[model samples]
Target: DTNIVTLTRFVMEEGRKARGTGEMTQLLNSLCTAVKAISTAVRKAGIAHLYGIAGSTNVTGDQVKKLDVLSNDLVINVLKSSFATCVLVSEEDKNAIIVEPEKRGKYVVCFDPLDGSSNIDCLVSIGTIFGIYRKNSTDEPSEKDALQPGRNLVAAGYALYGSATMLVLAMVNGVNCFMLDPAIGEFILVDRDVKIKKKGSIYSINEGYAKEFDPAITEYIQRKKFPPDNSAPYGARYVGSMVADVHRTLVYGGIFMYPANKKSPKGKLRLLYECNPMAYVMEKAGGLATTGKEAVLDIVPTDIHQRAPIILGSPEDVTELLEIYQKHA
Candidate 1:
């Protein structure tokens, strides 16, 4: 039997020794503590109430609202009390929250506290998304601090709360994955040096806004649908869930995009917490992330809610998409 306690002990010990002294070690330690707290809560209570008001939704998606509440509450409470983080941003919330009053830390985190809640009512795979960044300054991180691009992220990760709970995290250097062994109540490192394969054939993006997208984006999609000269053609799959869609790309090799369109001129996803962190993870895993023109990290944030075109996954697909955008522009 796989002993999670042993695994967690090894990882924590190895991770601490590997990095030695730096912000990376501090961040990882904090992550370990936070995960432990969450796991304990889950074990004690089958489910915990996630605080926050939910908008009106039908029965099919009501559970999503509730999951969001639970996840945010657990994460916020744990992170705040531990004083390990400076600013925390969540997909469920509109702005960033400063957890540590002194604001002495060097890290900022953005997360989708609960993902795929819509599937909870019927039992479908769901998870969480998190991105960590180095604080711009020792000053307190405000909502604006959360808008930094992906390249700026110090670490990015996710915890899949499904049949089993798993945590996948990426630092500036590499990506790693761990499994939460409920029996031992610890996160055991399962895959070290996890790298996303480079040659994925699938593409994920909402196609309904095809017309609203830049001409290059449209042409690129068309090319994927009908490759010339007997080239392999890729299929498109989108679940409209950022965590699920991105995780699929991470595992199977593909590209995921949420570009600016007529309906959403600024783009839909949050910048500080979602896009930046994931971009960092993808890049560390031998993939790439961009906002059509510039590298995601290079783009200085202008606001907390700033949005941008996000294209990430396999290097081939990202290059092809960007080339199209450049030529058309």
Candidate 2:
């Protein structure tokens, strides 16, 4: 297309419009390079013998797949060398990584370098989720820089590696999608200002844990499968992978839930790495995100590896769930 806009051009233009120095642009450029590298690895995983587990578990106790470990290293190295980030948090790490003072910049990044790693072996769609925040205080880099709420995020985005690698980003303006043109090794803008509908005919969640779910989540899901009125039941869709499931919810307009169950009362998803970043994207796209009683973005992080119940998607659907939660309150 004659009017094609690559991710590099788009971010550079956006950076100029904001009267920003090249820091934000450089940070994003570095991120894109990391994503592209990961995409290539994922594409050749089977042939390149990158499918097996990495012989250990991550901080979250999940099996560390070879691909997962590799992806984490790629992101950490790329962002640290970008010289635009001072603090880094990753799902694979137990502690936040503070860049050396000489290389430190003002930004903090929290990311899940290889979300949906469980699906990697089967060739299912997986992704990387990231949220960026500028240092709030003029001080030495520390975990504090990475432990901010979703509302404080300067930018949030994800790269989904599927039939075609797509990077979806949301800033102060709106959500945009870019597809990787492998031939040119560039991410070309394909969709702009992506917005979710107010309601949709689907619900994504892990129903296998329904027996252990709190009353609110159980009630909310019950209504989806068995509506009180004459309306048809919302279709059930669960990918068992946050990125894939949330991506579907974002595109098709539905609610995606990871609630507090009896075993994990707080929830399983990481507050900083996964929930908050996706929450930022969801809310910016005209949808809603919540932990039943509170908005997801409004949450203040207490720990770098904190977990929280997250339910997000189309506003109408989320509102319905929230009302049910309030009733249980």
Candidate 3:
């Protein structure tokens, strides 16, 4: 039926129809290449002794894992050589990288090369998160080029290296999922233009921090566990990995939250790395993403490593939380 479409063809077609320049397609392809290598490395990490800490800490203060450095280097190498990127921001790096003038392109990319690194040693699911933005000007690129708000992202997505290595891409028009076929060494289209339900019966969060939560978040969890209307309580699920948690929420339908507490009002998840890309994906999937008081994408970013509270998923579920925030306010 000539029915099966590979990620390469899918992206090429989308790029051609969207704009004349194909830089975006090339950039995405480069990203795909990096993820494939990372996936293989992750699968064999145990036997290869890639499990322990890398003897250093990342810019984010997390202990660097052997796999984390490997994954980050892989991504940096691919993207730097792609010639489609002008600036790069990474969670592992202390500063943004401005591509050399001769090799610079029109896009600025920000990413968390190996997210959920804390779970790598245990063989838990982890993934890479990325968000892409077009350069505002053709002038010299700088760190500021990568500081744009999430709303300005031209594309955002993630590569989940779990039971199956899946690449989920979110663009202006839609969101799609592609699964890597190890035998063929290509990502094949699995789900296209996916959408989430307005409301879902599952709620994902680390309730261990229940005592630290703001009154509004506490109330929201309370309602989920013991609905005032006496409905069945929302099922609780927390994978502790953004990619895994968000991936399940995207497909099965649920709310995934990482909220700010009195100790960390700015929240734990990096706005550019973890929150923006996922927020863009959630909104593209017809869901909602917010910081309770404001839309996640609307917040202007001042730093590449800035963190923020993230409450995103099914529209109705997110809205209920926002309403509770208002009530508490």
Candidate 4:
């Protein structure tokens, strides 16, 4: 009898089921290695000169921090060494980097090198978000190669660096989480095939956009907070971190919303980097992820850095939120 497998064992076994796709498993190992290296660097942020700004800007016009740049560069070099990704997209870099021809590589990856960097200086939780696509003979290394829907993803994951390092992932087999054992530098399996509840007690959303929000969403939020109108008495908890918020919802059974309003008409989160990965994991774990318009994973990407309004959580929580959107739309 065989039991208790590591990351390499999992991906490699999955790859064995296919004839020519074993390279994908090797590539994924490289990505995981990148995450491990990143976590090490994050733990030594101040001592390693990684606590300041990099004097750069992402596509969204946000200032890039030192870790943001370092994380991107580190991930690129590590993954590139394995030649896993033929084309790469990351939050810190504007354009997609075509490392090689699509035929020469097994996958294309998009990632947020350092999500929630705004709070890193204060010793707050920050994480990395990533999604992967299997390259096909039909596509080139241009945007067209990585230009696809989240639903087309073979795997998606994120790494959180806080008091502890955790890696959560979904690979169509099921949703799983691994905690890094710093003593061994290997991810130890903490949870296997984790399942999330359909409804949770917490609701995370930044109500700072109340002024710019639609009356429907605004009114809905008001009902949840004031005198606790006839509804789920949802408590507000927001840490200003995308991965952190969604991670909480996955564990605690609640909603994490970043709705589009007057200020950010398309909503703030990037479809490829943040929303897609989280949405995929949530869905696999018996949760739901959506836009006011449709399922978040269902939307095909027209651009690499495309933005969208995200509403993700337990199925019941998402259903409640969507009912309100239905009233307005």
Clashing residue pairs, backbone N/CA/C < 3 A, model 4: 200-253
Pull out the clashing pairs in model 1. 50-69, 50-70, 110-273, 146-272, 151-297, 200-253
**TM-score of predicted structure 4:** 0.93
Task: Between candidates 3 and 4, name the one with more favorable TM-score.
Answer: 3
Writing each residue's lDDT as its tens digit, candidate 3 over 1-329 gives 25669888998887775575788878888999999999998899888888998878677687888888899899988998888999999999999998887888899999999999768878899999999999997568999998888999999999999999999999999999999988777889999999998889999999999889999999999899899998999999998899999999999888999999988898999999889999999999999999888999999999889999999999999999999999989
lDDT agreement with native, every candidate? 0.70, 0.89, 0.91, 0.83
Which of the predicted structures, 1 or 2, would earn the higher lDDT when compared with the native?
Answer: 2
Model 4 worst lDDT run, 10 consecutive residues: 223-232
lDDT of 1: 0.70
What are the RMSD figures for all models against the true structure? 4.4, 1.2, 1.1, 2.3
* Model 1 spans with C-alpha error above 4 angstroms: 1-11, 14-53, 56-64, 100-105, 117-122, 139-147
Off by over 4 Å in 4: 1-4, 14-20, 101-103, 137-139, 226-232
Tens-place lDDT digits, model 4, residues 178-206: 88888767766688898889878787888
Model 3 scores worst on lDDT over the 10 consecutive residues at: 14-23
lDDT of 3: 0.91
Ranking of all predicted structures according to TM-score, beginning with the best and ending with the worst:
3, 2, 4, 1
Model 2 pairs whose backbones collide: none
lDDT pick, better of 2 and 4? 2
lDDT for model 2: 0.89
